[PDB]
Design a protein around this ligand. Sequence first.
Ligand SMILES: Nc1nc2c(ncn2[C@@H]2O[C@@H]3COP(=O)(O)O[C@H]3[C@H]2O)c(=O)[nH]1
Ligand SMILES: Nc1nc2c(ncn2[C@@H]2O[C@@H]3COP(=O)(O)O[C@H]3[C@H]2O)c(=O)[nH]1
Ligand SMILES: Nc1nc2c(ncn2[C@@H]2O[C@@H]3COP(=O)(O)O[C@H]3[C@H]2O)c(=O)[nH]1
Ligand SMILES: Nc1nc2c(ncn2[C@@H]2O[C@@H]3COP(=O)(O)O[C@H]3[C@H]2O)c(=O)[nH]1
Ligand code: NA
Ligand code: NA
Ligand code: NA
Lengths: 450, 450, 450, 450
Amino acid sequence: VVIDPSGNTYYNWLFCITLPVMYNWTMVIARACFDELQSDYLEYWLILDYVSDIVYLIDMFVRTRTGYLEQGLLVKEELKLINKYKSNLQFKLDVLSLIPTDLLYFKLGWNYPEIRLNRLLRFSRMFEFFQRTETRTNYPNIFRISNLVMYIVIIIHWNACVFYSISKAIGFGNDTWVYPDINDPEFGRLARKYVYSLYWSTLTLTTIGETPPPVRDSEYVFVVVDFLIGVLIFATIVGNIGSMISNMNAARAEFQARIDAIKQYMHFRNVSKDMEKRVIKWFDYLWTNKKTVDEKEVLKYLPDKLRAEIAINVHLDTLKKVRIFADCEAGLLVELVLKLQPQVYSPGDYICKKGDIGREMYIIKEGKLAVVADDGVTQFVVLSDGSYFGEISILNIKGSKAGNRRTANIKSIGYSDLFCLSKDDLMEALTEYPDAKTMLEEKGKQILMK
Amino acid sequence: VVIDPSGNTYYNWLFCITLPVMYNWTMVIARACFDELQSDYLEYWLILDYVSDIVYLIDMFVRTRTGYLEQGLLVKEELKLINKYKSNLQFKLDVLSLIPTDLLYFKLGWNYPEIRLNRLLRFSRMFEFFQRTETRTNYPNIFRISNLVMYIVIIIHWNACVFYSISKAIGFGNDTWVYPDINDPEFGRLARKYVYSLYWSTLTLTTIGETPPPVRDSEYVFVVVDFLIGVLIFATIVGNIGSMISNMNAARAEFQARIDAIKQYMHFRNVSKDMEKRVIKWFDYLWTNKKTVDEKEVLKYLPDKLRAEIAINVHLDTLKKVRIFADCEAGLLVELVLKLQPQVYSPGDYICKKGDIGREMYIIKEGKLAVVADDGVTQFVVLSDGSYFGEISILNIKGSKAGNRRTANIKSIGYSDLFCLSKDDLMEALTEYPDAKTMLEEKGKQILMK
Amino acid sequence: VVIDPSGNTYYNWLFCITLPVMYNWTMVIARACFDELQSDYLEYWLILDYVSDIVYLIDMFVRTRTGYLEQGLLVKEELKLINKYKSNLQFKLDVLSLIPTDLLYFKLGWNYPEIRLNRLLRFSRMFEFFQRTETRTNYPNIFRISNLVMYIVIIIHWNACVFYSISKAIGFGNDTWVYPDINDPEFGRLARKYVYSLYWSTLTLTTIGETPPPVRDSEYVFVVVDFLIGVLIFATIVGNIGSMISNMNAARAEFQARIDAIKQYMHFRNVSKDMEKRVIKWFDYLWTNKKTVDEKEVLKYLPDKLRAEIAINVHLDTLKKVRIFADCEAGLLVELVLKLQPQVYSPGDYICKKGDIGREMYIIKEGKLAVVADDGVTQFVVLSDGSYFGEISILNIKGSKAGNRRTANIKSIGYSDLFCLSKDDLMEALTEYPDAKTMLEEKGKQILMK
Amino acid sequence: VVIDPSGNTYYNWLFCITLPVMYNWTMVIARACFDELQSDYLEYWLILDYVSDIVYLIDMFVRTRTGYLEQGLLVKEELKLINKYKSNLQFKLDVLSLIPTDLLYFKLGWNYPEIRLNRLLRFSRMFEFFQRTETRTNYPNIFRISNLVMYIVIIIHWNACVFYSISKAIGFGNDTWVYPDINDPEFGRLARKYVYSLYWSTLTLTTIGETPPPVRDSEYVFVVVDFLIGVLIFATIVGNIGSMISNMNAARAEFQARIDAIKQYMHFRNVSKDMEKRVIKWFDYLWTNKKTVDEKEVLKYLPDKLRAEIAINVHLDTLKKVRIFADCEAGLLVELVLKLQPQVYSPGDYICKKGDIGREMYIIKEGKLAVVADDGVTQFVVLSDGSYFGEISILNIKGSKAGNRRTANIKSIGYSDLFCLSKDDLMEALTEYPDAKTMLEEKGKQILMK
Ligand SMILES: Nc1nc2c(ncn2[C@@H]2O[C@@H]3COP(=O)(O)O[C@H]3[C@H]2O)c(=O)[nH]1
Ligand SMILES: Nc1nc2c(ncn2[C@@H]2O[C@@H]3COP(=O)(O)O[C@H]3[C@H]2O)c(=O)[nH]1
Ligand SMILES: Nc1nc2c(ncn2[C@@H]2O[C@@H]3COP(=O)(O)O[C@H]3[C@H]2O)c(=O)[nH]1
Ligand SMILES: Nc1nc2c(ncn2[C@@H]2O[C@@H]3COP(=O)(O)O[C@H]3[C@H]2O)c(=O)[nH]1
Ligand code: NA
Ligand code: NA
Ligand code: NA
């Protein structure tokens, strides 16, 4: 065997089947409308159509060999897959899109390729590929815009073909509206035919209108309907363009809107230009160093038993340098990684101060912190990455003259990325295995006596 | 009896009255402006107008026979309904729209059907039908787009009629702007008249402008006002189109935006392509198997005493296979169905692990789980649908060497849809009837000894 | 005083000063550009300009006599108000807009009314009136759309005047682009002048372009700049139109989106058409009876000491029929009115059932409820409006064989609007005055014995 | 060293390098396409190009001398900065944009300035400056709109240059579509050349289309592609304009939407016009006095150890007049400034009333309050700014006949801005230093006895 739709093989086949479906959606109508296209390159159209039909057949086979999830397990029983396929509307659409209507080439002649129009009924495969690509691609907005542009181009191409067909029905050159006479040297070339039809279609759907006005009632009606199709469908698609660009700007726009609200508040309250500059510097840091997004709000949509792995694969850089995690229990790190709230501190920010509520443990992910003196400048100890502080005031200790108080003040030399671990959480998670707690308050007593 | 507006009969009548109202809103102005329309098909217009008026009268009768809610009860007293009708502005509008202005046909002649313009004053019924359909239809966006297209078409039709009337007032063919001379063979046909007027209207309201420029001051003024009506009203309607397409994409766009934020985080943090593929697979599963929507956020707008029924009608498939619910008390299932949080687990995800906080009971809705050994591969027990686990570590038990600990580790073979029932909730809800609890810890002791 | 800007007198004056400001913003540029406008109606323009200037002077006086809030109190000291006025930029703008530039009529002649262009510098007053109207009017969206239309019209009018002025500078009729020769009988009329200039302006700003193309470099540059002004500013304004219509649809669109999510869930889960019809009926009820909006989310932006008054003025209809409120303490009703959560129940919905957690007291605002038998049909007692139930299981009672249990089952005959009062809240709020509690458990014992 | 990108020097250099990048992005294509531009002002183009290249070199030097943050510290080691530069793609782009392609002037002649097209590869610097300006400027929306207008102008300019180049390739005047013959006196001027090309570009990108239709297939194709570029890219940019105006209106629109929901509720519930006027007055006050924004929601994105400084720099005006803060401990004010919830009370609003739950302490930021008698009018004490009340009922006091009760009723004479400090918070924060608490209940006893 089976294909496992989640796999890469299924996605690759989705591409390989979208190619004929897109080809069919573009060219069947073109060949049906522009007769010279069908006739001049008939030897190539036959090859391409037969290849497309072969790929359609192989796609039907793949649909027979693609497993589905019952009880969460991939069904691998062949006949079960055949039944699941045939019971779905997709099998009906596939049989309809693979009906050998090409036999009508013997009746209607080689000049009627619209018999292959049923081949469009595999559009679903194409759309599936798109909805898969949009999910799996690393450039979701580039692909989304390319998809919208493809839809625009297909719509304009189809409307060009429709215009040319209507000109044919009315008669080429019978009036100033229809496509001019084919017998003209310049206006008889297939290139000119298609490109002028596309020009007309673009002017009509984009509602520019710089085309000869209608002459007949059918022409007036078609032009009204087509200008309305233009207005509505092009507003739809080119406003989807707008929404895609909006969601492209979503993060940056939200960040900038927050900054603007802050600046409005500061200018209204006449906040000192010192503090205004400090705030602007904080936000410039958040942007430049790519910290505007908070991983919590993003990863909250992941499963906890997958977001856990995510956090591990991101923070194993530092949670191996820490003494508590991955050293004593070697598994405890998972119990708290999904609750280590990542904070960022500016240069000179006092994370801790003597005589404060010690309700948070900190793990230094990045940055240089200092166990300073209360004078403000004298740096007693420099804590680099992997260090952990703020854990002594969490625990119950014998001989602690300072209970629930910070034993020292910790300031940040530079921008520090820390993991604030709350006291309640450390309490709750160390209950399972105190084999790490013993050396934890080993460190605790050792630092509390000195 | 009375009609009970909530019923299907009332909605069917809403359709049956919207038909004449829509007919009146489309055709009265057309016949008033295009005199040949009124004259040539007068025998049909008379029949249709009289049928419309009869339906208007029957709608007034229905309004006299439609109950309203006082004290939440449907008023069935006839005279009370007559008073409620006559006291509402709707009765005034109905009498105004049913005034026999057709008598003016004897004074103004058969060429003045705008006397029936008062018939438009039942627009409310039409709009009511729409606002009912949008609520009750299964295709809300299809109907909404059809409604907007109907508004566009009606506006363009009315503007075409207005253009033709203005041409008539100025005189057909008196200058290049107005509709050409009626005496022309081609430009005198009612078909050509209406269709060219519609063409002009479309070019003006869509602001394409490929029409002969005005000549007189009245023409310049009307064209300015009409181009502005075009800009404003068509932006309104065709931007409502945009918002409707947006809300069509709302679920998919939110899902894809979450996926994009996740992928941005993973690529920025250089998350391993293993875990990136796992996350993409999780999201592909959520989409393909239609799990992107969380029933909680959707059904939270339902009444609890209706959302309860909803959850029951959805989850009675599994809550009959469970041993606790619908078996001992047979009513307890409602006390917890509105708090069974549905979770989804990937293949191989450890739902439970030995030596963890047993604070959640799980009911396997769909999927195969395994009571494995801690080695990781040896599957002791396979739990299929209807099974419940994680309930032993909830309860107070005699002789439990493992208190508040998982007696075994449960992993998911495939994608498991479970119902996580919190410990606090099971505690709170079993307090009412311990007739099920006794066999609950029957199972508890039986599994805790073996 | 003083005038007290919050008062109605200040708003009326805002209108009376917006009239000259709007007049000045519309007509000064018109008279400056269309010389015939200035000249032909000079006797009227002089009167209107002098009246506008008098009103400007009276507006300056009002600004001297309008109090401001210092320490939250309206300043009534005259000289303090004069200082507050003169210290503001508004005084500078007012003196600038009232500078007697009309004296230049003696130097530049009566054909130069753009000397009155400084009169536009009172635009602020106009805008203030708008921002006041939008706040105080009952039709905020009608006024907002009228304001946007006024901006569109003013922009188009100004661009028409600019086009005519540029034609004058280049010379009327010197090329096909500029306004045609004034000496023409038809193209020399002030009506034709202004209306064709407005036509050109509309075609340019709405970017229709059906105007003679530029000839000179200045004309090309102006047309480029004006088409870009068109694109940008008209997108701005006519997209503000879109956002205004969106916020017009905001409530209805949110309601309908909730209904659509519900219907999607129900159709996906194959919810029985019984329950689907019940849900659709619930939502039809919510809409038809105007219950889609929840007063909590709306009134949460009001002050509690004003939202309290709001809730009182709305619910004094029923909280006078209740026995506890406004009867014993006569003031207790305010302590709980801001926490009476309004619920709606469908016909037949069991609000209470025997043997359930009695943690909510209910006050029947509207609707008929029944104290039924557990059989389901036998109605023991019918509770109409003003009745209160679910209070016995809240209180501590002697001789209650049923503790924390519902003494009877309450069902809703029809759609009941109730006030669910939580047990914790009744406990917390009755602590202040048990003078009502005594008769509360009077009723309690009386019903618990029978 | 180093430059410290957060500093003002780096931003100034960002401007000084954006000037050549913008110059290059505007003029290289212009000179490449309009040959007369390159030739006539070659002496000036050479100077400007060499100055631009010198500034590019100095920008490369700056990039070598700009520190980056490792461990949150600004790297000042020269060679480390050289490595960080050369290891980034920016160094590749800078070397590519500074390659001396001007040497090709000796081969291709002075008429080929597109060899300087590589100079566009420093676009990043320009964009960086923009993203810095948008952050640091006080007019974020003005700058954003200016940036979008710059993008529009650059796109139109580039498309004008492209049109002129295509006309050159096809041949000037070979058909009606291309730019006319250069040999024409009027259509040969560089001014006319560029300005008509810009006119064509504006008509095409804004999709007005009032230009001669294409003649050749290449012209038709280019016009289709360019009209589509117009539609898509101009919708993008001029809808970004819409979103920028939306976020300009965001605060005012949210405020007005809240007011509209309130007014809809009041008119639907038939709220008395007294209370409707009171609510409208409250909202008029909120707007006029600039209180629609709540500093909590804005400043919650700031760091707590920066939002603290913000609140201090804003509220030190009053927290120096208070007796508790900045007087006894002199540091306690920071422990509670981030939890002082700012409330606003209308004139006559009873903040406190005798016999109520004293769970909030109030600090009068602005406004006159009264310790009144319960009669309602007799004002015992007038509390101005700096005063604090509601603190007696917070504390545990000996001899308090009124426990957890308000000792008096406080009403607001005028609009009072207060700081509501919750009881729990005062309890929690005074635990650290009771040196202020002693005089706190000094005041407490002193007022409780009298
Ligand atoms: N007092 C003290 N604290 C230190 C030293 N080195 C690291 N620290 C950390 O500084 C922290 C300050 O807050 P805590 O008292 O909670 O915990 C303290 C220790 O974790 C040291 O040498 N002396
Ligand atoms: N230990 C054990 N647990 C089982 C077995 N079969 C099912 N389970 C479930 O596995 C669950 C693991 O978590 P709990 O200990 O809370 O509850 C356990 C039982 O509900 C079994 O055979 N042995
Ligand atoms: N048992 C009983 N309850 C009644 C009667 N009339 C009204 N009620 C209300 O029905 C309510 C059901 O819930 P509670 O027991 O909390 O409170 C009960 C009473 O408030 C009655 O006649 N008998
Ligand atoms: N009773 C009384 N209260 C006063 C007086 N002056 C100020 N107050 C304040 O009024 C407040 C009312 O609420 P509290 O009793 O909590 O605290 C009271 C005091 O803080 C006074 O003279 N008498
Ligand atoms: Na156009
Ligand atoms: Na157009
Ligand atoms: Na046009």
